[PDB]
Amino acid sequence: DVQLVESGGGLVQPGGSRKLSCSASGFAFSSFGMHWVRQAPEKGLEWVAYISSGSGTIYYADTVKGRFTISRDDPKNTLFLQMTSLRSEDTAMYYCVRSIYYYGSSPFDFWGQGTTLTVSSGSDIVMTQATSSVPVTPGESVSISCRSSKSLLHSNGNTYLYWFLQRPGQSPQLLIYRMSNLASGVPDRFSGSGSGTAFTLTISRLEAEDVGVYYCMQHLEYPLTFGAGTKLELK
Amino acid sequence: YXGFX
Amino acid sequence: SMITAITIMALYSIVCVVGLFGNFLVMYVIVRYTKMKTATNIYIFNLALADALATSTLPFQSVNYLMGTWPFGTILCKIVISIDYYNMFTSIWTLCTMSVDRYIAVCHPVKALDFRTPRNAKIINVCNWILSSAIGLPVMFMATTKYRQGSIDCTLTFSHPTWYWENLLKICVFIFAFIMPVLIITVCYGLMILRLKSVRMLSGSKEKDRNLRRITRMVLVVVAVFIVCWTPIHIYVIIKALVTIPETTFQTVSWHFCIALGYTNSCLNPVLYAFLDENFKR
Amino acid sequence: SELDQLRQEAEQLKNQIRDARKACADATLSQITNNIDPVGRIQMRTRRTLRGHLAKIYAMHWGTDSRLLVSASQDGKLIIWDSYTTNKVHAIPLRSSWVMTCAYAPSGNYVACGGLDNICSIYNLKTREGNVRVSRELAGHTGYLSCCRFLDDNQIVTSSGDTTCALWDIETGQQTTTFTGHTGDVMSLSLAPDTRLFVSGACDASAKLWDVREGMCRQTFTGHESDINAICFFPNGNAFATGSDDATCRLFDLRADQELMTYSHDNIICGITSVSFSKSGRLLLAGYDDFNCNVWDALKADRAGVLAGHDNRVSCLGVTDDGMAVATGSWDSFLKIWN
Amino acid sequence: LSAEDKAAVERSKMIDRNLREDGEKAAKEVKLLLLGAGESGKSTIVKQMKITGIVETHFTFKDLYFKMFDVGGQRSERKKWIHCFEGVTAIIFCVALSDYDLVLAEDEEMNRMHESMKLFDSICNNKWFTETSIILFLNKKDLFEEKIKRSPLTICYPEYTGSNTYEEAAAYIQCQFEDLNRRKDTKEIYTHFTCATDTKNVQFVFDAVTDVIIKNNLKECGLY
Amino acid sequence: NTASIAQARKLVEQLKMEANIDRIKVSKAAADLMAYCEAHAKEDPLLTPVPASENPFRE
Ligand SMILES: COc1ccc([C@@H]2SCCN2S(=O)(=O)c2ccc(Cl)cc2)cc1Br
């Protein structure tokens, strides 16, 4: 049973410091490239930091480099994010995310429960979901769209586009990896397609639990970037 | 060795 | 007069050419065939490399004696002096460390299982390289070009008291490059032979005894070649530094033959180890 | 003298069978193919060397995507390679290092191995845990495991030095069908393309065709003079070659029940370790103790080419399902990809 | 180039590093192949060196980690799997001295001692074991002293013309076994007269293995 | 003895079955193999190598 439990959140004055922790159990923590992703209260997902298996590679988002430090303690199966000079714009839910990378793997396949942080009072690829909400009725069929400012198709043949579903009150869940691959455990009524720059997620016979926000994400190059999200409302 | 001087 | 210089330059050229040829063939064979997989291959590689670098300096010496003047400038004078001292010290210390490795292999096999990894061989090579730099650098700085009586001299200038510093350098070279290396090689190889004399694979059969005899003969040949090739130049240096011996044409021929003998060790190094190597004959 | 009357009756049945085979030997494959063009210049090159094993390699198996492959070596490691990049995808540590065989499930979800431990271990490559786990240890053979092939994710066929073959239910771990009748060590087996039949090669110098679902021997093929080390189905399932210590490869047609052609050269005297067909069946690739792989014209028996890139016995080889490449594995601890 | 393959190439190197570090341990291992006819004293030797095909045991002595493999029950052709043990450090061949006088079975071809001698001939001369040291444990010496008092060695060796003393019979048997080595100059046999109580036998195998290590290092260092 | 008699009748049962199988002519058997090779020669990349742009191990 895979578990990731973040802790350390709370209320902090601006300019202060705070260390978040992510506690891993139920899997081979060491061999998993961890990722911190944050979500502002009424906003979309924003990638924060990445530390590879073995700690050989670390990447930060531009808005956080210099201020945040990501680390891991493999013997105790714990991930850390040491934050300093906290600003009001850092107030968000922080998700711990596991991601293993090898031929045919499914990155971003498990997200933590999230911890809440409250701070008192260019070259990056832009992901565009032009449709902010969509009204739907059960049994019908939906098509969500996403576009990239650059081609996501690589010379190796892969197109590095991911689809996530965030149900209300829960952590995001991987649906599609590399545009067309169906994630493990997700019902076959979801399917993804596209070509190069424009992409489409199609749901067949939409059910009740399918309601939520759908984010697209590019993994062609760092920093990883999400779309604004498309909401599915009941009629 | 020894050369130069 | 001219005959003596002709013979001196002929010996210089022969030594240089055979040293370069043998060392480069050893380098090619080592890089192609052996693969840097055994610890002994790393040592042979470094020995051949430093030996060819040492041999590279000979024709500069030959032309310096022939013309009696140095035209290649102060930069090249510094480079030549530093590279010569560097390569001499590195070749000698590589010989010493190879002998110590063999002694540890034969007399401490259980420890040799752990201590004789190729990574440790490369570490020891790097340490030897650095410790030779620790004396090459001061010689590099002190190397200047001074106007001699005839045309020019590429020599070393020492701060006053210059006699004190020159004597200290000569004594340090003689000790740390001849006496202690000879002692280390002799002691290690003697202990190795004493331990080999009491092994079950060589005691009891004519063939076995013959193999032991040939191992001892190869060890003794290496040690004798090193002693014979490095002793005369050092004793000549010490006798000239201690006694103001009058200059004669015989003095010049003897001195140049002593230098050629000091570089004959370099020339014979590959024969001694690469060529005689049983593994090499595969 | 009951044993006498039976031993003499078997000789009469052998003569009947020999005569029936002679009766339908109206021609030879060799004379049938004189008219067709030779294959000509087969100039194969090494495109990849897979480095990282530290002992002899005895087996490998291509995945069905023609890109991943698994190799098994006595260093106790099962390595899965991405042959396109040479990246190692997984390195699986074996409980027993005395492995002789490995296999890739056609689904790609599982690998298998085993050897002198007499156990066929099944490994789950797609765990939630993120690592590879032993999912089953198939116990019951009484000699070394010489070969194994998945039928699907729940069924696998094994060959053993105990002279038997077996069909296993992986879920329950039980031997559900046994295949007895060989009188010597079974060295190799090959699944028919439709997986309804398999052939086995044994140290009795015979090959046997087995019906998987009925659990009995349909046909028996003799002709080799020594050990059969290797066997491979013709791609259409109507024939199969037989690598043997006699430095010969004798393709046997099932329906005609006899040898059609032998592939040998006077200057090849070493054993054969492995055989495989190209996608069209035109090329027969064979690995030799003399460190080389020979490429034979399967229709005309002429040697078409040589793969000489190893410094020790070639122990295994395989051709991708798409036919694009052949891999060779060697006691020298390297694999090479050729095309 | 290398968009997400960068994390894949990093993983390949991270597991390529653990293969290297696990192969360094294995290269220090002393690999021992235990052979001998059933009841020759093999499992007793295992007990002495201590506190389903290939039964295995490992133990430490004088800071050397030994790995011993007992082929055990293996009903198959040796020639098909024996080459797997090419490269073992040493073979330990156990011989039951007291088996020399065992009566032939119902259809037994030769006596127990002669079948053991035949096994030794095949192993010592095996092409895969040309450069392998053979250590011979002549075991069950205690029973031999009781049997030799009443049963002459000529039952086993009709050509034996010596006396039925321990010393003459033991020396003759040892010679008979060692004479089977057709490559004495390239291969050396280490013969020990162990028993059920003998404790220096582990030391004997340690001493024999140390000489083998010396030969390998001399071979590697170019001196051989 | 009791094991040699059980194996001896197993050999008779097996030989009886093998004698009764349907066999075709070698000439027909050889023709079928030739027909397969010719029909699939174009899809065999080892027989007729493809350009480097179609070759995964050179791309
Ligand atoms: C000033 O004198 C000397 C000082 C050092 C050395 C060499 S170079 C670095 C290693 N040493 S070593 O101690 O001999 C040595 C050799 C082999 C091994 Cl495995 C371990 C140690 C040589 C000399 Br002449």
Automatic annotation (TrEMBL), chain E:
InterPro entries xrefs: Gprotein_alpha_I (IPR001408), Gprotein_alpha_su (IPR001019), GproteinA_insert (IPR011025), P-loop_NTPase (IPR027417)
CDD domains: G-alpha (cd00066)
Membrane topology: Lipid-anchor
Keyword annotations: Cell cycle, Cell division, Cell membrane, Cytoplasm, Cytoskeleton, GTP-binding, Lipoprotein, Magnesium, Membrane, Metal-binding, Myristate, Nucleotide-binding, Palmitate, Transducer
Binding residues annotated for Mg(2+), in chain numbering: 43
A Gene Ontology molecular function term of the record: GDP binding
Chief location category: membrane
SMART domains per UniProt: G_alpha
One example of a Gene Ontology biological process annotation: GTP metabolic process
Superkingdom of origin organism: Eukaryota
Keyword GTP-binding: yes
Record: residues binding GTP: 39-44, 70-74, 139-142, 196
Subcellular location: Cell membrane; Cytoplasm, Cytoskeleton, Microtubule organizing center, Centrosome; Membrane
One GO CC term, this protein: Golgi membrane
Family, per entry: Belongs to the G-alpha family. G(i/o/t/z) subfamily.
Protein name: G protein subunit alpha i3
Top-level taxonomy: Eukaryota, Metazoa, Chordata, Craniata, Vertebrata
Gene: GNAI3
